[PDB]
Amino acid sequence: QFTDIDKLAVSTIRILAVDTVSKANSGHPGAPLGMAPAAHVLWSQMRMNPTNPDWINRDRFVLSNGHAVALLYSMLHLTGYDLSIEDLKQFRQLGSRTPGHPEFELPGVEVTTGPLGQGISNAVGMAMAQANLAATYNKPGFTLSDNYTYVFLGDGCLQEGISSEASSLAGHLKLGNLIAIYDDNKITIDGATSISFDEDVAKRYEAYGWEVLYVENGNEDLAGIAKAIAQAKLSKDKPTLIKMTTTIGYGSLHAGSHSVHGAPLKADDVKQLKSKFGFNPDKSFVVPQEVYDHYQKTILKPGVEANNKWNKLFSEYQKKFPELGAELARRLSGQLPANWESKLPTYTAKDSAVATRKLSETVLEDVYNQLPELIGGSADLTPSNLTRWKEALDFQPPSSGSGNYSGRYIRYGIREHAMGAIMNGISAFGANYKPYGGTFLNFVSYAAGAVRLSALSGHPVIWVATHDSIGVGEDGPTHQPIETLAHFRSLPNIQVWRPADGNEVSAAYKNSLESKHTPSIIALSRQNLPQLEGSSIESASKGGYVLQDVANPDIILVATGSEVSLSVEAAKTLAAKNIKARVVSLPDFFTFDKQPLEYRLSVLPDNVPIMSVEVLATTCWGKYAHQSFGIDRFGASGKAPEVFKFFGFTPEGVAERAQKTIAFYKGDKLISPLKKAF
Amino acid sequence: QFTDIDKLAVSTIRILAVDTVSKANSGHPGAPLGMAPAAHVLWSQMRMNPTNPDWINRDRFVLSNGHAVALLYSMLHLTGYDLSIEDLKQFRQLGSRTPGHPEFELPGVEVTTGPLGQGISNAVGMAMAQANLAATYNKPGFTLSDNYTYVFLGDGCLQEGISSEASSLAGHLKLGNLIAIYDDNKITIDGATSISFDEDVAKRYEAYGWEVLYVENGNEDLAGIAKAIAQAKLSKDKPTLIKMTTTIGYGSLHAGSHSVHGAPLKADDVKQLKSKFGFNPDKSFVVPQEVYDHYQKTILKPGVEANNKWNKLFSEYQKKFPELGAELARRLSGQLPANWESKLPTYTAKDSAVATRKLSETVLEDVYNQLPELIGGSADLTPSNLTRWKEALDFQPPSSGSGNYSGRYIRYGIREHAMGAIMNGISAFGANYKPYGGTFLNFVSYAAGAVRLSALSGHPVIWVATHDSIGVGEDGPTHQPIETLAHFRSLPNIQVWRPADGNEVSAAYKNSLESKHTPSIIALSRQNLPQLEGSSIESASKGGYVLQDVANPDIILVATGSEVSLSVEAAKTLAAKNIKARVVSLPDFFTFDKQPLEYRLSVLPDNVPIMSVEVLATTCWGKYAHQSFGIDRFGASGKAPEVFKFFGFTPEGVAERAQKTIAFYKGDKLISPLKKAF
Ligand SMILES: Cc1cc(N)c(C[n+]2csc(CCOP(=O)(O)OP(=O)([O-])O)c2C)cn1
Ligand SMILES: Cc1cc(N)c(C[n+]2csc(CCOP(=O)(O)OP(=O)([O-])O)c2C)cn1
Ligand SMILES: [Ca+2]
Ligand SMILES: [Ca+2]
């Protein structure tokens, strides 16, 4: 039963979201205005503690259409989160806590949203991380895990293929605690949805295995909106999409036009709206005390009792189940196990040539049981990526007979972008989740809308990107990366590790997992590389290091991944002709850059020529090397030795370019590419 | 009526594709072995001329599952395209015309495929381009355009977001002549589909507005296949999917296994099935004369006849409708209207400061009338990208009441990756189709899959990417690009234009439209920007040119887009403190690198410090400058002028940095970054 106050609370939500777009004189007013009744209804039955945004068993809410953020900040403020009328009064302004799109980093904001289709896929990830936490820790007597994931979305989310990718996997996985409400407002920026989008969302969703409930009058039916979510909570075997019809910009004079989508309302239109709802038209940012009181009583005071009772059960649990409680309290404290690192593989040069892809499989094989928070998967390339450790159980519904939700290995399908954002949501659940997803380095590019947000929000997810170069061979240029590393190296905040040998793969994993805020891509060879003489975990961990040194080098050859051994061989040729080369192995541009300049300048000093060697785009390399031997045209079908030799990446071919670099600069003093003037 | 030579033809297609894989000792047998019945039936009834692959009214066929190439290469050889047994004997080998994934460049090969979901989405662009051309030029008594677009696709393209995006748009647009045939083989790489893919595909595509037909015995039932293709052609208002079930690896000793997907069949397995199919175990790449003979009568000689009749109808068209005939003939010679460039705008430092986005809108107003083949759109951003001319008509079905199929403005919905692939389809069709579509520069990264293939194939599509930086402002970080141009400047064969003004936008559109092999991205400003005294279409067409010069510069300032203006202001300020700065505008790194070195070196000479100015990542600028002022962190929400000011991008902020560059280097001799050792 809802009452007068529920209706005064919905009016307050509607107008506070309108005073905030108008004062910023920038923003989108229309979806706040029409979704306001369901935000009131939903939020009021979420179990969450506004004083503790981090409580692991809090029901979690995603705004997949994050352009509607004025409603989120209104709810956050009104139900007792740390966001004030003053914060609200500096929406979209430089330096505020109120950006024009939700950012993961604020209290009460789960993920960063605003690219469409990204929120819904993030929330699927979250529903997967819950299902797994429950099956791993919940003991009879101790339901530590059971929260729902609530997602608000629009037409725009539903047109983006990532949502499709995501909803198919979610229907496959039978994720019944994910409840999605969709704003069936019939508008997007260009006009009526019918002008492009006129399909059958409900029949398309039932083909995935989701339940579709409908709310025909989303503008005023609080009781139907409430009944749908009630009913939805019973479909435990299938997720729910609730198709809810609303008028965009409800209450506005131009409500239902695409004009209310993304500009502030006209003064005159905001004044009538206020009167219309019984608010004074000349007063901004007004919150009725009965409203503050309502939410205190219905949401914040219950929630703090809920988080209290959950703690008492968890302290009991740890007495009863010591091992499991210690493990879980560690995941919650965000610690990796003490000296987990010791289980990592070290190698010598007597050991054999292995592609860094097999070596990968062996770190996984040697640390999964160390790290129960590690959950992994492949986008249909498990045999090519070698992402399954042998004793693994698949993350599936128990109904499947292929696994169950205690399993820690997911089969993502040929769905790369969706894997990006599901791992970003699994990471985002907490309980120190460490997701890693495998695919081929060229098709990480299929997942760039997700991969970018891992950097921006700071979600420390791992992509095990095998088949890094023309080493791929016969499959040819549709499958051979050129511009890939160069792209991700231009994106702020992501490690891009291209390990050369066993000990360089173990430093890539060490740094990747110890990371709390920076994603990582590990680019791995298809082909066999030898064990370098000189690589340790410790020096590879500094991101870039001197693998072989000479006193007074004629040249410094800087190389990554498969090209470091070529440089060690090219250096062997050069010595024979009395040129002294130092060989610098540079495994991660990011970690390297984080070293002190004393160290970086010792690796790449002044007065020596530096020529870089890597079989991909040369563009990114001018910040370390003086000359660069790389590949700036697409690849070729051929046996991979034949493809490297075609392009000239042979010992003597590299050596020759080093000799031409020496000759070109002879009698010039040289300044390290590292030294910056401002 | 299918007889015994249809049965001989399906075993020859099968064992020929098997011998090709097994001799390359690399490749995918599975799908060629199961789809070979359907390749036979469909090609037998397709209207095409083997001896002329360019006939505009040819029935087109795309293998979206490009990994089954060997089926396609067998069919092209047998039906009389220029491809031979020796070509086939050189499959997946460096230098051959038979690469491991199909490539646009071969005759018979329509677009390159091998990334999943791309071939099917191209087919939709191709089907639109049929629809459009038929609506433009067909007259009563002159059906010059009436062909079908057939696709073959697997479960993996049905798992990719892009094909959902494209199918949703193809259903809305009602493209009844687009027939897709799904290889329902229950396998993919990891294993069976139930493991990840278990949705009702049929109910999903019906939800889009597609007609779904079913063939239950795709392994043997040639007549069933034939009847679905027939029923399908009757669907004049619905595109069709034929869900035809096969057995992966059919005929093999490991049929139905997933080890038959992408490895050569074992030697003895190859002998058991040649024997089973009544061929000799110990002979290979064997085509019975009767198959050659069969395809001669069934396909080559009829298609030649039909092409020839097309040519006579077209000569009479040119008599009857002389001006429309004239036009289609120009397009089919691939010529652009003589002296079209005259309608391109020019400005002087007199004219108002306009956003590059509005100047773009203006080039569209002046050229669409000149260029009948310019068909454009937006992925739900028409009022933001300003991509529609005022006298336009939307590309939509007759029934819509909102446009028709002769319309030249597509409403794509929020479907960026689909729009880039559909655009490749439109372009790849022929008749000088010049496609474009806009979005925000940041979300072109969502189409990165389709965009790489524009470059690999050479489909000269144009991206209109407005909102090129932090100049966006209050939407903030999720919408401001940092990495985007750096990435796309790392990719071979794509022009990444970033005009500073009127004249620079016109240079961008003429080079972009004159292009026959390179796609483009034009990065356009939201904010107003001043016309520059010195810019000219002639100069900006060279990709980089001296905009302001001095006799003996203390420093050269190289900027792009909105920072060229900033750099002129910085130059006034430096002049006052007596530093002489030459300011260089570099609108496209590509077009600039295409210049004679001799020219480039006059723009960027040795022995002057060069410093680059741009509000995006510095990592690509190492190839032209000594120091770089740019932004390598993500942006922020605030009034745009405050965000520029925040990052130091101010006239006096740029000048101070220019002075420190001068000061840092003073006394050293400096080599221009253009110069290489080898
Ligand atoms: C990937 C992507 C993310 C974006 N934010 C957009 C711009 N954008 C934001 S909302 C929208 C379309 C209208 O979206 P909606 O979900 O229907 O919202 P409503 O409030 O109903 O108008 C567009 C094109 C482009 N591209
Ligand atoms: C974008 C992209 C393109 C690729 N080629 C791959 C690898 N790939 C090729 S086929 C396939 C999985 C099987 O798909 P299918 O169409 O069902 O093929 P079939 O022969 O039926 O097993 C995958 C993962 C991943 N992702
Ligand atoms: Ca909408
Ligand atoms: Ca398959």
Curated annotation (Swiss-Prot), chains A, B:
GO terms for cellular component: cytoplasm; cytosol. Changing H261A: Strongly reduced catalytic activity. There is a cross-link at K645 (Glycyl lysine isopeptide (Lys-Gly) (interchain with G-Cter in ubiquitin)). Mg(2+) binds at D155, N185, I187. The keyword Cytoplasm does not apply. The modification Phosphoserine is found at S284, S333, S400, S490. The active site is at E416 (proton donor). Its cofactor is Mg(2+); Ca(2+); Mn(2+); Co(2+). Keywords: Calcium, Isopeptide bond, Magnesium, Metal-binding, Phosphoprotein, Thiamine pyrophosphate, Transferase, Ubl conjugation. GO terms for molecular function: metal ion binding; transketolase activity. Changing D380 to A/R: Severe loss of activity. The record marks H28, H261 as: Important for catalytic activity. Thiamine diphosphate binds at H67, G114, P115, L116, G156, N185, H261, E416, F443. Catalyzes the transfer of a two-carbon ketol group from a ketose donor to an aldose acceptor, via a covalent intermediate with the cofactor thiamine pyrophosphate. Homodimer. Present with 40300 molecules/cell in log phase SD medium. NCBIfam families: tktlase_bact. This is Transketolase 1. It comes from Saccharomyces cerevisiae (strain ATCC 204508 / S288c) (Baker's yeast).
